[PDB]
């Protein structure tokens, strides 16, 4: 409903908690190539070492990935010098930070939300899986620290030491950071905590009802497992040899001529490792790109307040809370969304004593008879004054200027 006289302004507002899921590392596979290609044959190994360095190169390549999956899980989570901890008294201005803070009752110090996530996500051929350097109990302590610092000290623990501040005063700096004035918190602080504690409830209802959101983590585990299972199945394939089983050929043929059969399998299997390692190197760069996006969100969104539009869900960003997940991270972004809005009238400038006035913050509106100046992102109509406005030019210069009377409180104070 666009026109050159009309504006809509939010008269109400909704806090929304969103959820964003990123994968951060793969299953750290390694293989003994020689045991894959020619396991339990000194003669196959003698044939394979005519092909030289490929076995060593593939071992270096898969190791190069596994040593990076430790680095990704470190750079996303290990963004803090100290394991900050919350007080025993939950004096957070009315916010229930009990569902996302640690649960002290369980064997691993994970939250109520994290325990949903770990239950929404689901051998001898020289193949192996290496353990991650950080256990989920260590990741749950890093998310404990990052979250405990966020609640008790805002962004200030990103910059230096944690500077404590009351939670509804951190949230006043947050609101002020989106052009919505500190009093819009305090005039509604119980409503903001109601909307927030209710939205954290909707998150549990969503995550508990269905796994379907966690496709971004599950697709990674599924792709890792299908590529491993294909590397295993290709041991059974013939490649044009008289059996695929190396031990059949080692029973049935004498060395002078068995070597012409076995070369088929060595070449066939080696192409089936170079295929897997190539898939995993392209994949590990896909997961590297996501671990670097995750490290960039944890730096800018959690450890800060971002101004980057739609970078931390929809709405104007207040703060976000990290939660761990199996091979990934989950952000709960908390956003101010303008709700109820109506359109009336507006003007670019007003005229007083032939000079023209512009708002120091906010924008002029008329309710249909009178004129006010309101902060732009939430309806709060002030009397138009020489305190709420500043001056430039004269009435003849501006397109669309309106007629209005400005109140200066110095007039009554001199006149009295």
């Amino acid at each position: 409903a666009y026109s050159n006289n009309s504006i809509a302004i939010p008269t109400n507002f909704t806090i929304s908690v969103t959820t964003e899921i990123l994968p951060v590392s793969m299953t750290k596979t390694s293989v003994d190539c020689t045991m894959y290609i020619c396991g339990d044959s000194t003669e196959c190994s003698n044939l394979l070492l005519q092909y030289g360095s490929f076995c060593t190169q593939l071992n270096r390549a898969l190791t190069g990935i596994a040593v990076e999956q430790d680095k990704n899980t470190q750079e996303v989570f290990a963004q803090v010098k100290q394991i900050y901890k919350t007080p025993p008294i939950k004096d957070f201005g009315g916010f229930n930070f009990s569902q996302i803070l640690p649960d002290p009752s369980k064997p691993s110090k994970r939250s109520f939300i994290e325990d949903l996530l770990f239950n929404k996500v689901t051998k001898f051929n020289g193949l192996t899986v290496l353990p991650p350097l950080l256990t989920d109990e260590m990741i749950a302590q890093y998310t404990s620290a990052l979250l405990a610092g966020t609640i008790t000290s805002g962004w200030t623990f990103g910059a230096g030491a944690a500077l404590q501040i009351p939670f509804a005063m951190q949230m006043a700096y947050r609101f002020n950071g989106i052009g919505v004035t500190q009093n819009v918190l305090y005039e509604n602080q119980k409503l903001i905590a109601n909307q927030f504690n209710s939205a954290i409830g909707k998150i549990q209802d969503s995550l508990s009802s269905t796994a379907s959101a966690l496709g971004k983590l599950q697709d990674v585990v599924n792709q890792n497992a299908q590529a491993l299972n294909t590397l295993v199945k290709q041991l059974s394939s013939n490649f044009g040899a008289i059996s695929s089983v190396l031990n059949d050929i080692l029973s049935r043929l004498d060395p002078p001529e068995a070597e012409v059969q076995i070369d088929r399998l060595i070449t066939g299997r080696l192409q089936s490792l170079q295929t897997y390692v190539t898939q995993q190197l392209i994949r590990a760069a896909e997961i590297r790109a996501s671990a670097n996006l995750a490290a960039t969100k944890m730096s800018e969104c959690v450890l800060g307040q971002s101004k980057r539009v739609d970078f931390c869900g929809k709405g104007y960003h207040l703060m976000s809370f990290p939660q761990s997940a199996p091979h990934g991270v989950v952000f709960l972004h908390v956003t101010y969304v303008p709700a109820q809005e109506k359109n009336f009238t507006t003007a670019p400038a007003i005229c007083h004593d032939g000079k023209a006035h512009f708002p120091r913050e906010g924008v002029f509106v008329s309710n249909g008879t009178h004129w006010f100046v309101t902060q732009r992102n939430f309806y709060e109509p002030q009397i138009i004054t020489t305190d709420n406005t500043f001056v430039s030019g004269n009435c003849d210069v501006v397109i669309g200027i309106v007629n209005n009377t400005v109140y200066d409180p110095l007039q009554p104070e001199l006149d009295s």
Binding site: D32, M35, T63, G126, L253, E257, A258
Partner: protein, 98 residues
Amino acid sequence: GIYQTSNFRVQPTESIVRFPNITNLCPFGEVFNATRFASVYAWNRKRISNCVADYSVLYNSASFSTFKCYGVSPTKLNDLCFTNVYADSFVIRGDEVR
């Protein structure tokens, strides 16, 4: 640092071999020294079964002008075990053995 250098692997402590614990010698002589061989257009065939098959007896025999393996090698025949053996039999000119 930490370096992956080799692979550890528990070795076999002992060696085990097992076959169906019996003793009948196979009927190879009834084929390779038969009183009569068939015409090639109506080639004969015996099924060899339920027996220990010593192939060294055949492989060493100078009476064979050719003895030629394709799916196995001759010295391996005594190491191998089978579900069935079929010996097909006929008489051709010595040139057509190729």
